[PDB]
Amino acid sequence: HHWGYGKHNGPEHWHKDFPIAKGERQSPVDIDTHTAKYDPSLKPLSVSYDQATSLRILNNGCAFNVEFDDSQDKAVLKGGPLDGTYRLIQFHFHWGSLDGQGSEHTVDKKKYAAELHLVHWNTKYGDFGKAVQQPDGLAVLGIFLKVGSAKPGLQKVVDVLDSIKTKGKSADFTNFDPRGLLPESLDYWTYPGSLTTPPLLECVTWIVLKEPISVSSEQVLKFRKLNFNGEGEPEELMVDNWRPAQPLKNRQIKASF
Template identity: 35%
Template sequence: MQHLILLASLFSLCTSSSDWCYPSQYSCDNQCNLPEFWNHANAACGGRAQSPVNVVTRKTVPDGRLTPFHFHNYQQTFRSSMKNNGHSVQVSLSHLATIQGGDLMTGYKAVQFHLHWGKSGGPGSEHTIDGEQYPMELHIVHMKQQYTDLSTALADPNGIAVLGFFYEESRSANKKYEHIINALQKITETSSNTSLSPISLEQLIPSRQNLTSYYRYKGSLTTPGCTESVIWTLFENTIPLSKGQLQAFSNLRFHNGMPMVGNYRPPQPLNGRLVYRSGAAALLAGAALLVASVSVTLGLSQSR
C-alpha cells in the first residue's frame, strides 16, 4: 500500500504526459499515467464495464448456454513474427483459426495473441480467481468474421472475443513453448521483432477436453483505449511452464530500457456485472465447496 501511495505522490509531483504505463515503468524521467490514471490518457478507461476483473467463484452464475467451443484450424501450424510492442509480446495471426459455440452469436476469427506477466515468474496475470493471481496470462484475441480490421470490430459492442488462459509453474519445461521462449531473446528491445518457427494455437493451450470449464463476462480491452466491446472467456485449466520459462519474459525491456515486468492492469470493479460459469465450471466449483465443507467438518471434529 505504501508503494502505491508513493507512486501516486510521484505522479502528482512530476507527471505531465498523456502516455499510459505500468507501475514498473514509472519514474520522473519517464512521466506517464499509471493504471489508476489511465482515464487521463483515454476517457474510456474510466468506464463502468472495464477489464480485467476478480472472479469470485461462489458469486458466479451457472449458464447452460455456455457449451464447449468449436475450434477450427487451431491445430494448423502457421508462420508469423513475434514482436516486442513496448508493453507486451505480440504475435499476429492470419485469420485462419476461428471459434464458434460457447454461446457466441457468430463465428470469430483469431487476430493476434499476447501475454501479461509479473516479475521473474512472480504473480502477473490480469484476471484473478478468488483473489489468486497467476504467474502469467495469455490472451488470444478474435474479432467477428465479417470484419476485416480491429478498429471496425471494436465499434461493435460484441465485436471482440478474447480467450484468456492462466499459467502455472511446473517442475519441467513445456516443450511446446520452446519456439516462443527461444524467440524472446531476439526481441528484448521495444519494436524489435523476429520470425517465429511454425507453431499452432492448439499447442499453446490445454487440450480440448480440458477446455469445457470456463467463466464468461462482458468487459473491455485491458490497455488503452479500454474499449468496452469484449466478450471475455477465462478457462479454468492452466498451462504449465517451468520457472525458467516464466522468468524468460522478464528479460524483455520497455521503450525506456527498464525491465518489462508487471505488465498487467489491476482488477476493475464489476459495477453490477455478472460473471457466468459453464456447466463444467459449476461442477468444479461445487466440488471445491464440498471439499472445503468436509475440511471444516473434520477440523471441528478433531478439535473436540
C-alpha cells in the first residue's frame, strides 16, 4: 500500500486517498480525564480469553499482528458499552522511537511509550469484512504501555520478533495466552471511533483501559529492531507507527469508574 508513517505518506497525507480521515468519528483522540464523565449505564466489562487460540504472528510492514482463530466464540469481549458478542481476531501494537511517544490515544495530552490494540468483531455480522462496514462492527480494547518492570506475558512475543524482522515474514505463534497482557484493573474510557490506519473506517467502539501495563526497556527496544521494509531492501526501522490524536468533534468520552 501507498500510505505509511513517513513525511511523504504519513497521517497528514492519508486524507487524499481516504477522505474519511477528516470525518466525524476518527481515532485516536486525546482523553481529557476532567471532562470524561462517569456513566452508570455501562454494564460490567467481560474479557473472556480462557479459550483463546493464537495461530501466527505477521510483520505486515507497519506493525506486527498476532492472529487468532475466530471461527468460533473462543476469545470474546462483551459487556461494558457493548451489546452482543465480539470475537478476538488479532492484536498489535503502536510504538515510538523514544519512550516519550508511541501511543495513539493520549491521556490529558500524555503520550505513552506504546499502545496495545486487541481487535474484536461483532458476531452479528458474520465475518470481519462485513463487520467493518457497520458503525458497531468492531470493539478495540486499547492498553497503554509504560517503561518500567518487564511484563512476563509479553516475553514470548518479544522473543519471536527475531524471526519476523521484515515485511511479509510470519511465524507460528500457537498457544499464546493474551490474558498475560492485561493490567489488574478493567477501569476504562469508551467512545465511538475508527480504525487508526487506512481505510480509517468509522466502525469501532473504543474501550481504553486506564491502567497501563509496564514493560521493560529491553522489551520495547526489541520492538524497535523490527523493519518496515522487506528483506533485501534498505533498512527502515519500524518505529513511530502511530497516528496522532484527531478532533473529538461531537463525541463524549464516558468513564466506567
